[PDB]
Design a protein around this ligand. Structure first.
Ligand SMILES: [Mg+2]
Ligand SMILES: [Mg+2]
Ligand SMILES: [Mg+2]
Ligand SMILES: [Mg+2]
Ligand SMILES: [Mg+2]
Ligand SMILES: [Mg+2]
Ligand SMILES: [Mg+2]
Ligand SMILES: [Mg+2]
Ligand SMILES: [Mg+2]
Ligand SMILES: [Mg+2]
Ligand SMILES: [Mg+2]
Ligand SMILES: [Mg+2]
Ligand SMILES: [Mg+2]
Ligand SMILES: [Mg+2]
Ligand SMILES: [Mg+2]
Ligand SMILES: [Mg+2]
Ligand SMILES: [Mg+2]
Lengths: 98, 61, 127, 79, 151, 114
RNA sequence: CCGGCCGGGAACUCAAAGGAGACUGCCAGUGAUAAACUGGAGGAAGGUGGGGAUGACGUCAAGUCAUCAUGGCCCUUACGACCAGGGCUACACACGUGCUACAAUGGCGCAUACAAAGAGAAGCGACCUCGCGAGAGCAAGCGGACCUCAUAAAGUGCGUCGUAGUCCGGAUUGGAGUCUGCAACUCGACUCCAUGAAGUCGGAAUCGCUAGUAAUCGUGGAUCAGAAUGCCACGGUGAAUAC
């Protein structure tokens, strides 16, 4: 019913955020399917290095956007509304949707 | 065309996106710019290597 | 009973389901011979079930996705090789001599900076 | 030939066409706008087109329909 | 190389016929990395040669390759002076590969109809010894035994 | 025959036979052949004369041969006399569409010369 | 409605977190008994397994006062600042790096296969309608394993051309169009019709590559309103030779 997606750049911080989410969700209710890995975005950049000429000198960078998904079909609403607003999500992006 | 509607070009031709260059924000360079970080090759790297830009890491795939 | 083998070659994942019976080969819910078998892995897919026993001894159901002609060919061959657990692993001793058990780790090498493909270095003038 | 489905003409140049036609050909009119299009409304008129340093006069004719005003202005100098 | 011993794996035997030499021949005859075209052409030429000569399929080309293989090759050597054409002994695999390359290039330089028929014609004239591969083949034999004392 | 032309396309397939004529390409030839209701792989010469008559009539409907040659040539001299920028490049001989004259402009300038 | 689409399940591919594994480790032989070397077994992977990042002390008064900062000097009723147009795209020549060709291992027509990696909100823009076309109207879905860009080309199954300046080859050029943008003339991209140069493997000389390498075939991304044969990046087919 209620599907929650979390975005971050680090792999373990998202894991601990998902662990907190699932622990609080199971404490306040039930019917948790656990986090879903889903693909991880790899934003790749390349930049010239020298401030003048030297075309061959290049540096490769990449940003790992990690994404997690967890859904709950709990009937009671007084548990989900209480679960919200009490969690900091370990200071990374999280979205609430139906 | 439809009437003299086209002729209404009395504008200073500045609002058009074509007029904006989208240079760097710290120093200003016409070249070596990217939209994501909004800076330019050189500056970007300084920030990435100093560890300012979050989630930026060396690529060794 | 059912027997499973994975099979992989060049990001070409297969799935081979061997089983008793005297059926035909089936690849991607369809016949290999219908899928151009006479040149597509003409004698690659049916390598492992030739040397150890005859082809017409065990029915099977294969399905592979990702890759190309030789990609699917090698993926299915590797899957079949790791899908012949009819009686213990005595056949792996013979298949080791033939070298079919081990897969081909060789893969496309990434494209480097200052080069064209992987090792084609642009020509330079004078020295 | 190209460029959409309709010609383009400058406005501060389009202010001179009506005056030229009403008062007849008096003298070539000096201008910089290398953008207007020879529209029929110009047979029997002369226009001075800028090239950077000097405004070259040029007389308009009947077979300059698909040709632009700056077209008859040679900016490349050769030996 | 200069320090490490090397050795290449053995290509898969030719389909159906099971001729390792034929599988190597398709490798040499391969162009632009297209085994399908090379296989089709080699089989077309093989069947044409067999039906033209009345001979079998396996050894019909074996006879021509046996009759177009050299024995010694001149290696450009210059120890103290200018180049000396010093003939040397040909290894077995080197002899086989050199004869194969000779056949392939001889068929390449022809213009009869197309590769399928040119290869068959080359095989026939190699069996008879009236082709161009054989004409180039006798050159090494005539140029052998020039400078032995040098090495 | 010339088929409303000068060329004698003998022992040649239909589309190629009409392509050999000036002012007509593959697409225009396809139009002609389809309108005449004649097969394409059949040779033009081996065909019967009853269809060559229809082909004459069909080909006569487009501007081709010396008519088209003079039409296109007249435009060149016209843009030369107009004094247009696009025209004054013809009198000298060099790219007029805007190619780069520094290099790779030898097709229109002819072989090199010191 | 016999489409993984709908009940369901999670075995498996797969996706992403954590672990195991390969370390000359077990054996044989060689070797001053040591280091080490050769071979074998087992093992998916045998000898830093393949690839990347990683660049010592220093040399070239090597490059950048133009990315930025900065010592010294100079201008400051102009070497500062604003605007229109033009120029950086010129062109009797030379050189560098590439793309497309000289064709039958091919060209063209029909049918028909098999991939990976990416982007998307003034954005990607289904389907349907109009147009031979570039495109136009309608315009859902999608801030994303969902929707779109996007039916990969080589490949293979049939037919044609049958060795020519050709159904190869595409430059140049004329006419007619599509589309971004205040603005396509100097000076953009793409499309339709017509013309169809040079070029039939290339002198001295010279370049890259030892395995998924080279070779050849497609796809994507950044810059960016509108632009690639360039740069970065992904996959298919896949060699020859190292005495
Ligand atoms: Mg711009
Ligand atoms: Mg400043
Ligand atoms: Mg370069
Ligand atoms: Mg590749
Ligand atoms: Mg071993
Ligand atoms: Mg190291
Ligand atoms: Mg210096
Ligand atoms: Mg300097
Ligand atoms: Mg200005
Ligand atoms: Mg410049
Ligand atoms: Mg240009
Ligand atoms: Mg063609
Ligand atoms: Mg884009
Ligand atoms: Mg994405
Ligand atoms: Mg054309
Ligand atoms: Mg020729
Ligand atoms: Mg753009």
């Amino acid at each position: 019913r209620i599907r929650i997606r979390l975005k971050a750049f680090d792999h373990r911080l998202i894991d601990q955020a998902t662990a907190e989410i699932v622990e609080t969700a199971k404490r306040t209710g039930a019917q948790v399917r656990g986090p879903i890995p889903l693909p991880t975005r790899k934003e790749r950049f390349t930049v010239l290095i020298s401030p003048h000429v030297n075309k061959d000198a290049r540096d490769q960078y990449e940003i790992r956007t990690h994404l997690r998904l967890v859904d709950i079909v709990e009937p009671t609403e007084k548990t989900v509304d209480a679960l919200m607003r009490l969690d900091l999500a370990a200071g990374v992006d999280v979205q609430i949707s139906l | 065309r439809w009437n003299a509607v086209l002729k209404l070009q009395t504008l200073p031709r500045d609002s058009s996106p074509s007029r904006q260059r989208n240079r760097c924000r710290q120093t200003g360079r016409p070249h070596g710019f990217l939209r994501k970080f909004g800076l330019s090759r050189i500056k970007v790297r300084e920030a990435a290597m100093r560890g300012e830009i979050p989630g930026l890491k060396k690529a060794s795939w | 009973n059912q027997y499973y083998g994975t099979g992989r070659r060049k990001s070409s994942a297969a799935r081979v389901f061997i089983k008793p019976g005297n059926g035909k080969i089936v690849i991607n819910q369809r016949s290999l011979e219908q899928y151009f078998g006479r040149e597509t892995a003409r004698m690659v897919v049916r390598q492992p079930l030739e040397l150890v026993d005859m082809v017409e001894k065990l029915d099977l159901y294969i399905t592979v996705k990702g890759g190309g002609i030789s990609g699917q060919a090698g993926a299915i061959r590797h899957g079949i090789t790791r899908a012949l657990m009819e009686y213990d692993e005595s056949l792996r001793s013979e298949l080791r001599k033939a070298g079919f058990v081990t897969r081909d780790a060789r893969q496309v090498e990434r494209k480097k900076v200052g080069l064209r493909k992987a090792r084609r270095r642009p020509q330079f003038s004078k020295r | 030939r190209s460029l959409k489905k309709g010609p383009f003409i400058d406005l501060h140049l389009l202010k001179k066409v009506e005056k030229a036609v009403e008062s007849g050909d008096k003298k070539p009119l000096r201008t910089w706008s290398r953008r207007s299009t020879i529209f029929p409304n110009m047979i029997g008129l002369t226009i001075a087109v800028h090239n950077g340093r000097q405004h070259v006069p040029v007389f308009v004719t009947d077979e300059m329909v698909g040709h632009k005003l700056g077209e008859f202005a040679p900016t490349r100098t050769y030996r | 190389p200069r320090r490490r011993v090397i050795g290449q794996r053995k290509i898969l035997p030719d389909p159906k016929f099971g001729s390792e030499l034929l599988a190597k021949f398709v490798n040499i005859l391969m162009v632009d990395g297209k085994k399908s075209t090379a296989e089709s052409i080699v089989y077309s030429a093989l069947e044409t040669l067999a039906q033209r000569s009345g001979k079998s399929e396996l050894e019909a080309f074996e006879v021509a390759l046996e009759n177009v293989r050299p024995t010694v090759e001149v290696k450009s050597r210059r120890v103290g002076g200018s180049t000396y054409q010093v003939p040397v002994e040909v290894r077995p695999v080197r002899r086989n590969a050199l004869a194969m390359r000779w056949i392939v290039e001889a068929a390449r330089k022809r213009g009869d109809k197309s590769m399928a028929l040119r290869l068959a014609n080359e095989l026939s004239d190699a069996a008879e010894n009236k082709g161009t591969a054989v004409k180039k083949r006798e050159d090494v034999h005539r140029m052998a035994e020039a400078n032995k004392a040098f090495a | 025959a010339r088929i409303a032309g000068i060329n004698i396309p003998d022992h040649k397939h239909a589309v190629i036979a009409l392509t050999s004529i000036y002012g007509v390409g593959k697409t225009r030839s396809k139009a002609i052949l389809a309108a005449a209701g004649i097969a394409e792989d059949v040779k033009i010469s081996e065909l019967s004369e009853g269809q060559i008559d229809t082909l004459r009539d069909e080909v006569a409907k487009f501007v081709v041969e010396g008519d088209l040659r003079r039409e296109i040539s007249m435009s060149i001299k016209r843009l030369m006399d107009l004094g247009c920028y696009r025209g004054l490049r013809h009198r000298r001989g060099l790219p007029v569409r805007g190619q780069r004259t520094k290099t790779n402009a030898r097709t229109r300038k002819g072989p090199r010369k010191p």
